[PDB]
Amino acid sequence: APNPYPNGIHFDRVFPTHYDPLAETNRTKANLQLIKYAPGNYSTLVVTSEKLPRPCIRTIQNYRRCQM
Amino acid sequence: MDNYFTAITLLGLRDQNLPPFKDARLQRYKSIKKMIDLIETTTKLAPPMPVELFMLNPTDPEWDDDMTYPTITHATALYKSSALAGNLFLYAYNYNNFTANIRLRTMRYLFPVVSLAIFGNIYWDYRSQLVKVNLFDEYIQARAQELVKQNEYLLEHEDVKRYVWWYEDLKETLARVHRQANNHKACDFKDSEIILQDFIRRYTNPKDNLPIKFHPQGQTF
Amino acid sequence: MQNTTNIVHVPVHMGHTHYFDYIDSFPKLKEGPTLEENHITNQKILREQLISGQQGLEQNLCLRNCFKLSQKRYIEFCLDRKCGGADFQRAATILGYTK
Amino acid sequence: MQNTTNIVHVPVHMGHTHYFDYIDSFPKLKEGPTLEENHITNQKILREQLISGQQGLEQNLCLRNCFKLSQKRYIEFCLDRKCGGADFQRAATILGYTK
Amino acid sequence: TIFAETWEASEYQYRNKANLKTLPVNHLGKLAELKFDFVEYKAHQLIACHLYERMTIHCMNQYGLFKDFYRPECLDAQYYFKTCVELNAAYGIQKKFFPEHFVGSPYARPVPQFQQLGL
Amino acid sequence: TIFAETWEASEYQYRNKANLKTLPVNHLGKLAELKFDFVEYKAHQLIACHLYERMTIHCMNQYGLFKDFYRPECLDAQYYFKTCVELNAAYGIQKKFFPEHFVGSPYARPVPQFQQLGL
Amino acid sequence: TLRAGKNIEGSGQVHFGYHDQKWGMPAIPMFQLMYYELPGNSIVVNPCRNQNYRLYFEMRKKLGI
Amino acid sequence: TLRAGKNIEGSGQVHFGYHDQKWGMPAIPMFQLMYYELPGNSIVVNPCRNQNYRLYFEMRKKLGI
Amino acid sequence: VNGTEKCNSEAQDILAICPNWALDHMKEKVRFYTKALAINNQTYIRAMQVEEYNQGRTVADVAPKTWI
Numbered sequence: 001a002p003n004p005y006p007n008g009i010h011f012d013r014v015f016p017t018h019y020d021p022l023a024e025t026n027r028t029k030a031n032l033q034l035i036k037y038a039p040g041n042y043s044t045l046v047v048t049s050e051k052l053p054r055p056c057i058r059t060i061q062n063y064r065r066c067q068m
Numbered sequence: 069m070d071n072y073f074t075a076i077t078l079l080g081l082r083d084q085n086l087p088p089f090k091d092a093r094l095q096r097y098k099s100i101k102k103m104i105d106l107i108e109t110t111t112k113l114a115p116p117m118p119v120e121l122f123m124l125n126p127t128d129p130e131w132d133d134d135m136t137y138p139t140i141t142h143a144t145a146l147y148k149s150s151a152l153a154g155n156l157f158l159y160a161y162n163y164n165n166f167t168a169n170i171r172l173r174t175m176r177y178l179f180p181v182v183s184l185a186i187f188g189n190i191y192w193d194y195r196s197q198l199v200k201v202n203l204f205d206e207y208i209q210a211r212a213q214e215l216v217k218q219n220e221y222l223l224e225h226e227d228v229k230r231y232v233w234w235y236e237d238l239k240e241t242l243a244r245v246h247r248q249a250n251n252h253k254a255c256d257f258k259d260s261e262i263i264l265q266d267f268i269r270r271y272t273n274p275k276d277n278l279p280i281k282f283h284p285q286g287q288t289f
Numbered sequence: 290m291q292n293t294t295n296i297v298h299v300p301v302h303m304g305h306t307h308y309f310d311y312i313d314s315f316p317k318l319k320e321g322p323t324l325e326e327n328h329i330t331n332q333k334i335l336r337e338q339l340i341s342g343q344q345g346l347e348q349n350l351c352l353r354n355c356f357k358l359s360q361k362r363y364i365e366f367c368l369d370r371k372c373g374g375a376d377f378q379r380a381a382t383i384l385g386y387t388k
Numbered sequence: 389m390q391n392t393t394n395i396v397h398v399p400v401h402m403g404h405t406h407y408f409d410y411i412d413s414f415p416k417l418k419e420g421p422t423l424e425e426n427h428i429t430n431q432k433i434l435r436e437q438l439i440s441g442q443q444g445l446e447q448n449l450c451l452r453n454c455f456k457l458s459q460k461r462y463i464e465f466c467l468d469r470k471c472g473g474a475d476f477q478r479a480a481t482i483l484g485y486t487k
Numbered sequence: 488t489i490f491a492e493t494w495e496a497s498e499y500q501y502r503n504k505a506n507l508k509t510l511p512v513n514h515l516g517k518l519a520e521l522k523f524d525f526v527e528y529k530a531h532q533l534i535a536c537h538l539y540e541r542m543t544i545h546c547m548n549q550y551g552l553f554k555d556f557y558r559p560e561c562l563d564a565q566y567y568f569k570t571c572v573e574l575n576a577a578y579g580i581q582k583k584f585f586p587e588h589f590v591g592s593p594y595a596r597p598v599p600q601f602q603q604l605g606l
Numbered sequence: 607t608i609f610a611e612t613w614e615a616s617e618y619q620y621r622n623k624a625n626l627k628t629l630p631v632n633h634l635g636k637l638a639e640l641k642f643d644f645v646e647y648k649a650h651q652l653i654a655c656h657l658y659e660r661m662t663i664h665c666m667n668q669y670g671l672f673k674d675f676y677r678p679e680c681l682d683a684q685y686y687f688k689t690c691v692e693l694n695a696a697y698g699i700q701k702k703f704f705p706e707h708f709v710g711s712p713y714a715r716p717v718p719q720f721q722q723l724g725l
Numbered sequence: 726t727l728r729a730g731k732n733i734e735g736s737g738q739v740h741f742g743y744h745d746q747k748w749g750m751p752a753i754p755m756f757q758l759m760y761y762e763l764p765g766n767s768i769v770v771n772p773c774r775n776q777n778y779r780l781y782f783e784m785r786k787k788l789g790i
Numbered sequence: 791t792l793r794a795g796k797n798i799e800g801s802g803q804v805h806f807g808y809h810d811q812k813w814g815m816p817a818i819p820m821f822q823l824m825y826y827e828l829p830g831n832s833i834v835v836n837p838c839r840n841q842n843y844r845l846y847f848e849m850r851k852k853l854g855i
Numbered sequence: 856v857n858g859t860e861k862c863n864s865e866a867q868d869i870l871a872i873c874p875n876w877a878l879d880h881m882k883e884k885v886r887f888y889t890k891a892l893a894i895n896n897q898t899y900i901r902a903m904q905v906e907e908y909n910q911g912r913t914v915a916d917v918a919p920k921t922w923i
């Protein structure tokens with residue numbers, strides 16, 4: 001799997017490690033007492049939307065149809 | 069359930085008993101609904117009085133000292149005195165060794181020097197704390213009397229008289245309020261509405277967009 | 290949101306030290322005079338105020354105490370009652386409150 | 389805020405039984421016809437629709453499919469192209485969309 | 488001011504805040520703790536905070552205010568009466584000037600007008 | 607669109623949301639993992655996502671796209687280039703239509719006008 | 726924190742979510758030379774508080790004490 | 791819950807704050823007769839799904855299958 | 856002393872020195888007291904409303920009675 005894209009977000013456990021994702025080529029593995037990395041090793045930023053309930057959609061369609 | 073004592077008094081629970089049936093009883097509860105709005109309005113027409121009358125202004129730069137309270141640690145001085153007395157017992161319990169055994173000569177020679185230095189610290193802290201408490205007590209009394217004579221004149225303002233006259237007008241008005249009937253209707257205080265409305269009309273202008281106007285020293289709650 | 294999250298409006302510089310995390314310096318931090326140089330400076334101001342700035346002080350203190358009141362009508366009552374009948378705008382110019 | 393907090397808009401009644409917490413009843417709950425009575429009622433409707441409600445159905449199905457389009461200009465294009473040149477307001481009256 | 492004997496318990500619960508207190512009805516069980524004889528009508532026990540007051544008067548008539556009133560059944564009646572009128576005055580003011588804090592108010596979670604939906 | 611080589615890291619961090627990703631500068635250390643010889647100017651390495659694009663071209667010129675490009679140094683360059691232009695496109699749109707989400711924006715926590723303070 | 730108005734789900738400081746954790750100091754000499762626990766007795770009132778006593782000494786001389 | 795968008799401070803279900811806890815079934819016969827754990831295999835798809843197969847039988851007859 | 860028109864600098868010092876939470880508290884106090892003002896005035900209108908049983912009646916029609 002490719003090296004995850006550099007992400008400076010991390011969470012310390014014992015001491016501040018000052019993690020720099022650009023200081024090493026391959027990201028070192030996360031030890032339990034040292035660091036926890038940000039979620040989504042392989043993730044991008046998108047925009048999403050919830051789907052309105054089906055009965056709420058049927059009333060919107062009925063209003064538009066009755067309107068036109 | 070605010071205005072509890074007012075509502076209980078208007079219902080007559082101070083002198084009589086409510087009707088035992090829910091119909092007439094629940095109508096009597098809704099009958100004081102108009103009078104509560106009137107008495108609530110009367111209590112929001114009080115004129116202002118100088119706030120610097122019984123309360124010094126806390127935002128004055130004089131109080132930027134952030135002075136603390138000087139105290140005497142009685143418990144600390146009493147413990148350390150008992151621990152010093154414990155050393156005196158330890159010497160007395162072991163008197164014969166500390167006195168005759170030459171291997172303990174340094175303890176015999178320098179025990180009182182350490183004991184005096186220990187007593188010196190116990191009494192110094194107590195004595196210094198005692199002086200600071202007395203300096204604090206004598207200043208707040210002297211400074212308070214200077215501020216009283218400085219602000220005595222504020223009691224000569226007419227706003228104090230305007231405030232008392234309004235309170236006495238409310239007392240005479242609420243004394244004239246009376247229950248007129250026992251029909252468990254709002255008209256049981258029919259004449260009292262006219263009395264209280266005349267009081268409200270006396271200190272406000274009903275034909276305004278905002279009869280009750282806001283000012284920072286006003287009545288909200 | 291992270292519980293240890295702060296928003297700072299002035300620049301800070303963090304230390305690049307292992308096992309430690311702190312602010313080691315502030316950018317463009319200029320050191321003023323020492324505590325002793327400031328003390329000598331204040332002594333000169335306090336000395337002139339002690340020698341040459343004590344006459345007519347009782348009147349100015351009354352004007353200052355009157356202007357710390359909440360309402361203006363109480364200030365005018367204080368000036369008229371305690372300050373020998375001083376004017377509002379005239380006393381405000383003395384104290385330096387007039388633009 | 390308590391994590392198990394719910395705002396309900398209909399009345400519920402909670403059972404006062406030890407060791408258990410649940411909704412034992414709904415106030416003024418009316419029981420309708422059984423699943424079998426609804427089945428017999430629905431079969432009477434479906435039987436009439438099968439016997440006497442299948443003539444001229446293809447035209448009505450085309451009008452119904454055209455009115456499920458997004459824009460009005462596409463509905464008119466559907467009626468003109470697929471439904472044999474039907475009118476918008478006339479087809480809406482057949483389907484029951486007109487007030 | 489509550490203009491009835493009963494009130495909806497949920498109408499005095501907070502909607503956008505944690506509920507750490509309730510506004511319960513008068514504790515009728517405390518009336519049976521009084522050992523002496525007294526006359527109390529049922530038509531007065533439901534109105535808020537008033538039962539505790541009548542209990543306090545009954546205890547201050549049987550006993551006084553010194554060394555005889557200081558018994559558990561009589562001090563709880565005076566404490567409940569003082570606490571009841573303090574909470575009800577606070578909830579009443581919060582009901583008048585902060586109506587949108589409570590469950591059941593249409594302003595706790597305002598429903599939008601249809602013009603705001605953009606349909 | 608970023609119209610410079612450098613950007614403030616804090617300006618692409620959220621103010622009212624948890625910060626789970628950053629927008630880091632180009633990883634110049636990956637440029638040294640290429641085994642072959644190539645010419646790269648320092649004037650092109652700071653602009654966002656372009657270094658990974660040039661690394662991909664250098665790798666696809668030395669090797670092809672079949673059984674020789676499939677080495678860890680070349681696949682990370684192509685993955686970083688694809689991921690970089692995806693994150694920057696999302697952050698760019700979010701910066702354009704949701705500027706109030708980021709630290710440093712005057713609308714993230716608006717300061718009121720003096721007429722709203724009632725003085 | 727609860728009395729200050731923050732309801733608390735769960736317990737402890739081993740944060741399951743996206744937070745920094747602070748484990749106890751490793752009881753080995755390496756960390757015991759770099760760190761030491763915060764002594765509460767070292768947090769003091771600023772000595773500038775003692776300068777308010779200057780008011781007392783001046784009030785005493787004004788009153789002829 | 792964390793992936794669904796709720797950051798978690800601390801851990802566990804022993805809520806320190808103003809929340810209800812559920813300690814887990816006491817392993818004694820009294821509670822083991824009143825309670826039983828939720829069997830996940832009993833949560834099923836509604837059998838009305840099988841009525842969609844009516845569409846297949848009607849389509850096969852229309853196509854002459 | 857000088858009027859509102861000559862206090863812009865003093866108004867800017869409030870917006871700069873006061874922390875942002877304090878400015879949000881100052882902004883909310885005005886909105887609360889605006890709400891409380893409308894509530895107190897609605898109580899005024901209901902209180903000062905002349906009911907049907909008091910039409911044309913003034914203080915002269917009141918009986919000389921007190922609370923007792």
Ligand SMILES: CCCCCCCCCCCCCCCCCC(=O)OC[C@H](COP(=O)([O-])OCC(O)COP(=O)([O-])OC[C@@H](COC(=O)CCCCCCCCCCCCCCCCC)OC(=O)CCCCCCCCCCCCCCCCC)OC(=O)CCCCCCCCCCCCCCCCC
Pocket residue numbers: 150151153154155156157158160161
């Ligand atoms: C879970 C429970 C929790 C409860 C909490 C309490 C726990 C219990 C605590 C018990 C320990 C304290 C005991 C207190 C008395 C209890 C009665 C008792 O002792 O047991 C019965 C005890 C018999 O013991 P036994 O177990 O049956 O058998 C003994 C063995 O056979 C062998 O015989 P022995 O004589 O060799 O054995 C000696 C025996 C008993 O020996 C004794 O005589 C006990 C003497 C204890 C005095 C402790 C110091 C007090 C200093 C006097 C202050 C007086 C102030 C008065 C002010 C006004 C007057 C001016 O053991 C001790 O010495 C116990 C002392 C414990 C150590 C204390 C050292 C403190 C130093 C560290 C400082 C810590 C800070 C706290 C200090 C608190 C100070 C208040 O009875 C007697 O000893 C009779 C004594 C009669 C003659 C004594 C006359 C008075 C002389 C006083 C000494 C003067 C010294 C110089 C003056 C210093 C100040 C100016």
